[PDB]
């Protein structure tokens, strides 16, 4: 678990890393008493009564926080990390501005918003392929009606707080583990 | 794609709420919608990027919102340093400046730039931007040339940018006379203008463009001024 939340450097949203949890002794309720998190919604089980694992870790912005969660649109639940309407598991994510958040501009952590496509449950897409927009073809350079598929989240001290890093920690409950 | 900025003239006292907008004549898709700041006698310099992202060491007071063809700058509490013209710029089919709105109160990577600032009649422009910080070949990154006159405002003119090789980019109002051509060795990028005009009196701007910054001029030149007078 703490190689997980602790970690000293997330990874981007469109590049979530991927924990396989096996042959663990799970303690569910190790971090509900760390007042720290922010959000925290299970939505498959109930919480209390919890005593393959997978953990899914990204960094989002704060107003992204609302994407992860069954039947949800926006730019990252789409073209991002989606989540299954089906969903058995927990979501829990807090703020890091005190840390993924240089003074002179963290670029470092990135988002995808163009796709022609959306993506599908637990769907992981690293494709820097040269977005289309426009008619003519791009032929893999950019420039007008060809832009990039990534794009760069602010993240500065001076931001608000629905334009902060926020790391999202994902827990899927797919008996080697209880 | 035409920017219409409003109002175009706005005086406040310190301390207000100044609300700018920016409509498009159609919907900017790609979301490229930028802000900035341009203090008299100074480059612009980037305020928003992206339709709402804040830039580097732009207070919380400056505030971007707006999508698809209504954008609004949200300036909280004005100071007597907001004293400065702003400006709305967008990218995607094209590249198009605003009017601009002149508010009146009642960093590593560094261009700068060369050249005379006195032309003849028939003659070449050239200038010259040289690029400390990043290099003038990056794969993420673009150059671009932009001058300033008040019977257009903020017109851009062309540039260049290296992928597997170099390619071009240049607006055609110029396209028939102009030609950007970078250094590698000396890690610069030259403008040239072949056959000047009075027209052509502008002051010339040389800028940074990075793709996953909302295609935003994020680092701007000096600033020259060029006279075409005989």
């Known amino acids: 678990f703490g190689e997980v939340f602790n970690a000293t450097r997330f990874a981007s949203v469109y590049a979530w890393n991927r924990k396989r949890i096996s042959n663990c002794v799970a303690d569910y309720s190790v971090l509900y008493n760390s007042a720290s998190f922010s959000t925290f919604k299970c939505y498959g089980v109930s919480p209390t009564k919890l005593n393959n694992v997978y953990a899914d870790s990204f960094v989002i912005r704060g107003d992204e926080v609302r994407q992860i969660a069954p039947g949800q649109t926006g730019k990252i639940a789409d073209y991002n990390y989606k989540l299954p309407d089906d969903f058995t598991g927990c979501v829990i994510a807090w703020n890091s501005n005190n840390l993924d958040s240089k003074v002179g501009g963290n670029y470092n952590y990135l988002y995808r918003l163009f796709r022609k496509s959306n993506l599908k449950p637990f769907e992981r897409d690293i494709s820097t392929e040269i977005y289309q927009a426009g008619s003519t073809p791009c032929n893999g350079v950019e420039g007008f009606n060809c832009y990039f598929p990534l794009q760069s989240y602010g993240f500065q001290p001076t931001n608000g707080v629905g334009y902060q890093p926020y790391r999202v920690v994902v827990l899927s409950f797919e008996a080697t583990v209880c | 794609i035409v920017l219409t900025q409003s109002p175009g003239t706005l005086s406040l006292s310190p301390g207000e709420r100044a609300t700018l907008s920016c409509r498009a004549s159609?919907?900017?898709?790609?979301?490229?919608l930028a802000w900035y700041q341009q203090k008299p006698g100074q480059a612009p310099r980037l305020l928003i990027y992206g339709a709402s992202y804040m830039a580097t060491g732009i207070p919380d007071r400056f505030s971007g919102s707006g999508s698809g063809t209504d954008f609004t700058l949200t300036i909280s509490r004005l100071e007597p340093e907001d004293f400065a013209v702003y400006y709305c710029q967008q990218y995607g089919s094209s590249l198009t400046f605003g009017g601009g709105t002149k508010l009146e109160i009642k960093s590593q990577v560094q261009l700068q730039q060369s050249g005379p600032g006195l032309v003849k009649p028939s003659q070449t422009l050239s200038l010259t931007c040289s690029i400390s910080?990043?290099?003038?070949?990056?794969?993420?990154?673009?150059w671009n040339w932009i001058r300033q006159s008040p019977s257009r405002g903020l017109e851009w003119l062309g540039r260049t940018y290296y992928r597997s090789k170099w390619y071009n980019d240049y607006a055609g109002t110029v396209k028939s006379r102009i030609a950007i051509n970078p250094d590698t060795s000396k890690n610069q990028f030259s403008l040239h203008l072949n056959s000047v005009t009075p027209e052509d009196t502008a002051v010339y701007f040389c800028?940074?463009?990075?793709?996953?910054?909302?295609?935003?001029?994020?680092?701007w030149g000096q600033g020259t001024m060029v006279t075409v007078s005989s």
């Open positions: 159609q919907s900017v898709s790609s979301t490229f």
């Open positions: 800028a940074r463009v990075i793709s996953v910054a909302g295609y935003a001029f994020d680092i």
């Open positions: 910080g990043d290099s003038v070949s990056s794969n993420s990154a673009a």
